[PDB]
Design a protein around this ligand. Sequence first.
Ligand SMILES: Cc1cn([C@H]2C[C@H](OP(=O)(O)O)[C@@H](COP(=O)(O)O)O2)c(=O)[nH]c1=O
Ligand SMILES: [Ca+2]
Length: 129
Amino acid sequence: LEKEPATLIKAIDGDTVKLMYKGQPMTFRLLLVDTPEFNEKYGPEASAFTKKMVENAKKIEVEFDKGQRTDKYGRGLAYIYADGKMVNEALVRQGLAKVAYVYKGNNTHEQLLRKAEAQAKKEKLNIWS
Ligand SMILES: Cc1cn([C@H]2C[C@H](OP(=O)(O)O)[C@@H](COP(=O)(O)O)O2)c(=O)[nH]c1=O
Ligand SMILES: [Ca+2]
């Protein structure tokens, strides 16, 4: 997998963000995770967490996996990095997202994220508390 440049347009919620990618505005849905909706327990904290990570970054990158790059709603499906740190993994490590939506051929970082989830759960962080 390869990291590509993007720039932040706007934070949206815990697991979606609007980025400019190859010059075009696109909503990105983070692969392999599920954050609570804003209206649910931990939803504001997830949204806040992702917002801070992407707004504070000097460099945002997008990494597509091997499979589908857009979902049925036209959202980009990617791993998102903020100054070299993966947002997807960070949310899971903090107990602000569950590993989820693991579909064959877009699951390169699955074991990495499951390892983060285990550690979040062992710590009883946030959704695991
Ligand atoms: C993460 C992800 C979501 N989706 C679709 C499946 C779910 O469809 P349904 O909307 O039909 O439930 C939805 C969940 O996204 P949200 O968690 O953003 O709601 O997005 C994918 O098709 N591939 C993916 O990799
Ligand atoms: Ca969600």
